[PDB]
Design an enzyme around this catalytic site. Structure first.
Site, PDB file in Angstrom:
ATOM      1  N   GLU A  60     -11.510 -14.576  -8.673  1.00  0.00           N
ATOM      2  CA  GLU A  60     -11.851 -14.021  -7.369  1.00  0.00           C
ATOM      3  C   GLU A  60     -11.952 -15.073  -6.271  1.00  0.00           C
ATOM      4  OE1 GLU A  60     -12.057  -9.814  -8.034  1.00  0.00           O
ATOM      5  OE2 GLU A  60     -12.273 -11.000  -6.203  1.00  0.00           O
ATOM      6  N   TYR A  90       0.807  -1.213   0.000  1.00  0.00           N
ATOM      7  CA  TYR A  90       0.000   0.000   0.000  1.00  0.00           C
ATOM      8  C   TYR A  90       0.845   1.270   0.000  1.00  0.00           C
ATOM      9  CZ  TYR A  90      -3.652  -3.316   1.435  1.00  0.00           C
ATOM     10  OH  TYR A  90      -4.519  -4.379   1.524  1.00  0.00           O
ATOM     11  N   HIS A 100      -7.711 -13.012  -5.704  1.00  0.00           N
ATOM     12  CA  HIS A 100      -8.220 -11.872  -4.954  1.00  0.00           C
ATOM     13  C   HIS A 100      -7.083 -11.069  -4.338  1.00  0.00           C
ATOM     14  CE1 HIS A 100     -11.535  -9.803  -2.960  1.00  0.00           C
ATOM     15  NE2 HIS A 100     -10.909  -9.909  -1.803  1.00  0.00           N
ATOM     16  N   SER A 130     -11.473  -5.302  -1.688  1.00  0.00           N
ATOM     17  CA  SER A 130     -12.137  -6.307  -0.864  1.00  0.00           C
ATOM     18  C   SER A 130     -13.078  -5.652   0.137  1.00  0.00           C
ATOM     19  CB  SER A 130     -11.111  -7.178  -0.135  1.00  0.00           C
ATOM     20  OG  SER A 130     -11.751  -8.220   0.582  1.00  0.00           O
TER      21      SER A 130
END
Ligand SMILES: C=CC[N+](C)(C)c1ccc(CCC(=O)CCc2ccc([N+](C)(C)CC=C)cc2)cc1
Ligand SMILES: C=CC[N+](C)(C)c1ccc(CCC(=O)CCc2ccc([N+](C)(C)CC=C)cc2)cc1
Lengths: 540, 540
Positions: free
Chosen positions: B331, B130, B444, B200
């Site tokens: 997914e 991130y 995912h 998510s």
């Protein structure tokens, strides 16, 4: 005197007629009585064998068509008139026809037996499209075809009664099968090589003879074209058959009030009505609005059918049996102009979404609203939920898969798994002379004219390729009748036709192109009808 | 001394840190407190704003990760541990981070606000994947990311009661959005051009803010990556939330033996337990064995959500809003090694037919056996009903469609139909460095590293094309943040990305090859989940 056209059978002597074909003549014996005329007190009764006769019965022309409804939906239209009676109607109609090659076979010859379709309410062996001269000339088999009682005269049933037991039309077919056993040799035919084949309701008849022990010993192979006994239209329960017979009696004044209405007096009153009076009310007894549903069909009495066809197919040992099965490309398109809203043979039938949803309740009658929703889910293209052309194909698939394609595939897989050798086809050629609109594609019943070699008729306007294609098909059907395998015996040059198994599920497409192998008779769709939808109806 | 690392906000002064990228430095302010520490009596309560401080708060490193479960399924494995906390755990965790370009922008700059996922039980803004230095450097946007409470500390709810109101983790997110409004201009960011984007459970969180009026006025665009608030996992009922909170309390000894059951003692007893003790019993309050189900999630209380997400989506007007939604290609594959029988990340997971049938009940928990039967009908290839590889991908589709792809397509269709301009994507590139097995495909969560420009990190083994690819996606995401349109907007030779509409349903595929329009986000499968299966559960 040509002794070829003079034959003696167990009942007496016959004179036949010689038929012309572009490649030689055949000997035809048309209108042979195989049963006592089922008239008067014999109406609704099982057939009695024809008593022997003095003299020479003339067997030069087709006999009378059994009493039946006559299609008037499109007067003067070839697509419908080609199935209507082409002889006078009469209850004295239990006659059969025999074609045999010229010269008569000195060998014993395998015998093909044709059972016509027509929803168990119509049909005749005298239709031009069932003309056996080209088949017998080209492949030198012996072809037999019978008339059997249809409608109420063949399948009205007050179950458990002696006056109207039911399925007497199936017995008419059985009696003609026994007649083939005792007499086909006099025509050069081998009673040890008898191959049944039928279409639509005829295919269901062939399937019900596979599942009836008394009929089982009268043939050795079977062909089911666009039909099966397990389908939702081919049988009916005792209670519903009793309700329909009582409904027909009430419409024609039986019983006269206020006399009693037990089974004896009810049939006794029914036997006094003119045959046409019964025909004129046959469709008034169907419970709901529908397509592909008929009033008087074989009943599950515990007699001719020990149990339901579905049960007998599941618990059946079919070793030593070879079956040929198949369907046409668009099994359901024909039936949509007979009750589906927005459909017409004279326009494109580009229906709306509301008409599609309305037609599903007519193509799939007698089901809950949740069941209908599942049908709509499975047959809607959700990227194009309202394209009229796709809605038209979808409803055609709904009627086709529900009534023909999936009951056949259900039968085909259960047969190959339980001992039988099975070959499967899908007829994909649309006749160049087809009169139905093109949006119908290859409709129900329009492979028959190619199986019977009609393109070889010089008075018709088929093309050169369709004649060659018709010869391929008669070879397939004859090879199967002779050997039990449609592939040419010593030919490795020809593209080969693999058997149908429960796992591989291989079938072939029949058209102008050479054979092409595919797998799965609409496997995803038939899984919905054969596997899920019963669970949806039982959990209600 | 470089003075651009010194910034004053409404609560006091900050010293930031300068981060290096291959194409220039970036100014970062990591660890800004935005709420008072939610400890002691403030556990389970809505956040209070951080009171002003004197001096210079050091903002040069990430703060503590909120207390959460730590994955131990595969120790040492990069695929799992890249998501595990990389700072010390603490309830003192309500801190946010701001990245800003160097030199600091002189005019207001659009703001991207990241919301991490993790099933509402895990996640942290400090995770390496991130890191916002590459996105802020390459597109000169302003990026903010916050920590929010997860698990019981963020979403334990005794509905109605005032000591455990529920959804406090969403209020944590909301408070960070108010902070961005009141302070992002001090970093050169435009508080009138703020774009939420999460993945998510973060995507679900973004959706909840779209449907929450108090949060809706704090942003103007939304990006939902592999998540939606209307799905079967992102919300829970009041009665079920009370049972889960009560079972957790019992599992840790609350209340003491014989003492009352009222909700104040229950929370008061829960506040005396060490935070790790609550974490260690988190997975014990779930109803059944399942994949993709989490204990403490947003509750439908009537407060933060006046009604269910499914209802609010149907009723809401989204005119003036731009939404970017999308999914990854596979997914459901990630979740299968967490409960589906026969699955393992270290073999091919070639499951059997029996294991597929068992996994469906784990992938679709607490549905009727009839509902499970319909699920199996839809995801079985009946020509190959037992091929292990097809059964593996079919179960992956079952979990992916039911939890991600179909709730997203439903939301995307309703948003576009009701006033919002929507863009849809499918991420189909599998990272060359991915450590999960090849059968999992594009799992995912593995578009995040390309959105954040991680391939640009010189200490990684990404390929040259993946770096070019990451710049395309950063441009897409940034263009949508500035203009509400992921297109350049002008080349115009660059292949364009059409909006997603309820009719055409156009989406693009994101991979190394240029953009490509496709139609239907699994149209047939989502019609089963969105349209049919609800009516099946209603008829029970
Ligand atoms: C073409 C196939 C040839 N073969 C195989 C012989 C064949 C097979 C199957 C059928 C049945 C066709 C129908 O199901 C129409 C049923 C029907 C008929 C009339 C009516 N009215 C209501 C009386 C007319 C009003 C509309 C209603 C329903 C025919 C011929
Ligand atoms: C990869 C995506 C990254 N992000 C987006 C953050 C992300 C998104 C979504 C998830 C949920 C993953 C799970 O559902 C594991 C659920 C689970 C965990 C533990 C257990 N035990 C029973 C304790 C272990 C036994 C199996 C069971 C189930 C994780 C990370």
């Amino acid at each position: 005197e040509d002794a070829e056209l003079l034959v003696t059978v167990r009942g007496g002597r016959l004179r036949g007629i010689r038929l012309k074909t572009p490649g030689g003549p055949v000997s035809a014996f048309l209108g042979i009585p195989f049963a006592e005329p089922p008239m008067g007190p014999r109406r609704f009764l099982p057939p009695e064998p024809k008593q022997p006769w003095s003299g020479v019965v003339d067997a030069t022309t087709f006999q009378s068509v059994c009493y039946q409804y006559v299609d008037t939906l499109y007067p003067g239209f070839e697509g419908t008139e080609m199935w209507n009676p082409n002889r006078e109607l009469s209850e004295d109609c239990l006659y059969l026809n025999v074609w045999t090659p010229y010269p008569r076979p000195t060998s014993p010859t395998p015998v093909l037996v044709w059972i016509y379709g027509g929803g168990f309410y119509s049909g005749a062996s005298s239709l031009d499209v069932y003309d056996g001269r080209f088949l017998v000339q080209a492949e030198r088999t012996v072809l037999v075809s019978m008339n059997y009682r249809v409608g109420a005269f063949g399948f009205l049933a007050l179950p458990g009664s002696r006056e109207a037991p039911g399925n007497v039309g199936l017995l008419d077919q059985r009696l003609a099968l026994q007649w083939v056993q005792e007499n086909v040799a006099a025509f050069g035919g081998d009673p040890t090589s008898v191959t049944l084949f039928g279409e639509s309701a005829g295919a269901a008849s062939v399937g019900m003879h596979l599942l009836s022990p008394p009929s089982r010993g009268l043939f050795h192979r079977a062909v089911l074209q666009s039909g099966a006994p397990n389908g939702p239209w081919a049988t009916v329960g005792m209670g519903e058959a009793r309700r329909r017979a009582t409904q027909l009696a009430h419409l024609v004044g039986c019983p006269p009030g206020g006399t009693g209405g037990n089974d004896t007096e009810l049939v006794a009153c029914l036997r006094t009505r003119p045959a046409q009076v019964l025909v004129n009310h046959e469709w008034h007894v169907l419970p709901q609005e529908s397509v592909f549903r008929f009033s008087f069909v074989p009943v599950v009495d515990g007699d001719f059918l020990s149990d339901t066809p579905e049960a007998l197919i599941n618990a059946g040992d079919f070793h030593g049996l070879q079956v040929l099965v198949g369907v046409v490309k668009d099994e359901g398109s024909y039936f949509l102009v007979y009750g589906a809203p927005g459909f017409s043979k004279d326009n494109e039938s580009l229906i709306s979404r509301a008409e599609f949803l309305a037609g599903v309740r007519v193509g799939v009658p007698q089901v809950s609203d949740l069941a209908a929703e599942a049908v709509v889910l499975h047959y809607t293209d959700w990227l194009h939920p309202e394209d009229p052309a796709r809605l038209r194909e979808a409803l055609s698939d709904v009627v086709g898969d529900h009534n023909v394609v999936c009951p056949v595939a259900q039968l085909a897989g259960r047969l190959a798994a339980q001992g039988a050798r099975v070959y499967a086809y899908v007829f994909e050629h649309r006749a160049s002379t087809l009169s139905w609109p093109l949006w119908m594609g290859v409709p129900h019943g329009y492979e028959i004219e190619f199986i019977f070699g009609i393109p070889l008729d010089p008075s018709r306007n088929y093309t050169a390729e369709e004649k060659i294609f018709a010869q391929r098909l008669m070879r397939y059907w004859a090879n199967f009748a002779r050997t039990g395998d449609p592939n040419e015996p010593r030919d490795p040059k020809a593209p080969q036709w693999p058997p149908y198994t429960a796992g591989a599920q291989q079938y072939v497409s029949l058209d102008l192109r050479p054979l092409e192998v595919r797998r799965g008779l609409r496997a995803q769709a038939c899984a919905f009808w054969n596997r899920f939808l019963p669970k949806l109806l039982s959990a209600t």
